[PDB]
């Protein structure tokens, strides 16, 4: 309503809103401490999670 009121009464062109928000990057998940040599390259993954 404001930006259509201005376009005729005060005769105002377009003024789009500007994103005034604040942002942050994302983090990353914990990976696997590499193959110790004593385990299994696929089962030790499931084992060493939580």
């Amino acid at each position: 309503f404001t930006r259509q009121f201005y376009k005729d009464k005060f005769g105002m062109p377009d003024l789009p809103p500007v994103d005034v928000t604040k942002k942050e990057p994302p983090p990353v998940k914990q990976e696997l401490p590499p193959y110790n040599g004593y385990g299994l390259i696929e089962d030790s993954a499931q084992n060493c999670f939580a």
Binding site: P33, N36, G37, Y38, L40, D43, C48
Partner: protein, 427 residues
């Protein structure tokens, strides 16, 4: 020069021969093919303790395989390193094992011992001067026992001046699968102890307990167990091939460990086995190394030495160490449990410090100690043998093969003598 030739016997002598040789080859950077890819000058320099050197830089492992059923030999053959093994050494017979100690000791071996002896003395002549031979077999396993008893018996007179190092798997006390296993064990142990000087006792249950405890992986393969035991053996092997302050000699260990003529049976233990998050959750300090190093749970041979004490102990450590930390930890362990050792020889501990680390982790070690930790094992086998023999079941097979029970009597007699000797010395 000092060097060693390997013998793998039985259908688990296969097991471990495969795993052990492949582990060493990966340590030394030899490809699965054989073309040496030199990256560690020292191991290139001292490869001769195990390996001859062939053209173009491949190295025969001076190891010999013995079995009866060609399928297992072909399977290990098919393994990633059967090509680095020998068509030369691939001697084998035609019969079926029958899992029969009697047949193995009298029928089947009677046409294989000849050829295998020819091969082994061929290799002995080929090389300069052995320290001896390491033989990997089973005591409960039928044909492994049947072969190995006769083989060691003959090589005893063949060379009375070398190291007959033997490695044996103890039957799971909870189950032997094969029900004649106690009979095979009582048959074997007599000649085993009579002929050998040093014997390694290992049991499957404790390795399974380790797998639950720190491996925590819940999906183990006997191959993973073999991976462990290969590292175990490598631990005591590293000394000879490596420089720095360390008494490497197996005869050194023998004269520092073996108090009496007939004490031979020893129990292993090893150093950091890294868990799920201990990789980044464990600080590698001599205190914690010794802490886990001398622990009941990490022990994996037979049964908790909580009941008994330790006659004598020996420990070798791989990495950049110094004497003060091992010294002070020795003081602490002596002053902590003044009773838990035998007064029979004060300061019953031996140390060794390999300068060379393993490839990937900084500090490792090997434990080996002689204790009163076999009483329960052979008393167990005593009750089993007595209970099954009192009605002489499963014995007509052996009568057909040509046995009699007087040898059973003398076997159990010698074994009870071992019990009595242990008890009277320590207790």
């Amino acid at each position: 020069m000092r060097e060693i030739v390997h013998l793998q016997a039985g259908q688990c002598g296969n097991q471990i021969g495969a795993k052990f040789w492949e582990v060493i080859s990966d340590e030394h950077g030899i490809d699965p093919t054989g073309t040496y890819h030199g990256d560690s000058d020292l191991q290139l320099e001292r490869i001769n303790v195990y390996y001859n050197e062939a053209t173009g830089g491949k190295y025969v492992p001076r190891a010999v395989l013995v079995d009866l059923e060609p399928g297992t030999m072909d399977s290990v053959r098919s393994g990633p390193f059967g090509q680095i093994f020998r068509p030369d050494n691939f001697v084998f017979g035609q019969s079926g094992a029958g899992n029969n100690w009697a047949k193995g000791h009298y029928t089947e071996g009677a046409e294989l011992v000849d050829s295998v002896l020819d091969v082994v003395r061929k290799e002995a002549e080929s090389c300069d001067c052995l320290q001896g031979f390491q033989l990997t077999h089973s005591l409960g396993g039928g044909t492994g026992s049947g072969m190995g008893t006769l083989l060691i018996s003959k090589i005893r007179e063949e060379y009375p001046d070398r190291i007959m190092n033997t490695f044996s798997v103890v039957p799971s006390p909870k189950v032997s699968d094969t029900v004649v296993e106690p009979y095979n064990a009582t048959l074997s142990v007599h000649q085993l102890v009579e002929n050998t000087d040093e014997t390694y006792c290992i049991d499957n249950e404790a390795l399974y307990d380790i797998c639950f405890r720190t491996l925590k992986l819940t999906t183990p393969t006997y191959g993973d167990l073999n991976h462990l035991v290969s590292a175990t053996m490598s631990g005591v092997t590293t000394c000879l091939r490596f420089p720095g302050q360390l008494n490497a000699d197996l005869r050194k260990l023998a004269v520092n460990m073996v108090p009496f003529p007939r004490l031979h049976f020893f129990m292993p233990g090893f150093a950091p086995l890294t868990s799920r998050g201990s990789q980044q959750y464990r600080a590698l300090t001599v205190p914690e190394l010794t802490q886990q190093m001398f622990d009941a749970k990490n022990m994996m041979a037979a049964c908790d030495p909580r009941h008994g004490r330790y006659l004598t102990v020996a420990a070798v450590f791989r990495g950049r160490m110094s004497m003060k930390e091992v010294d002070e930890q020795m003081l602490n362990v002596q002053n902590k449990n003044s009773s838990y050792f035998v007064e029979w020889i004060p300061n019953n501990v031996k140390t060794a410090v390999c300068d060379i680390p393993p490839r990937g982790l900084k500090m490792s070690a090997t434990f080996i100690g002689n204790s009163t930790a076999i009483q329960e094992l052979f008393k167990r086998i005593s009750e089993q043998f007595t209970a099954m023999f009192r009605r002489k079941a499963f014995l007509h097979w052996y009568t057909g093969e040509g046995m009699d029970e007087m040898e059973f009597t003398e076997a159990e007699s010698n074994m009870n003598d071992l019990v009595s000797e242990y008890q009277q010395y320590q207790d």
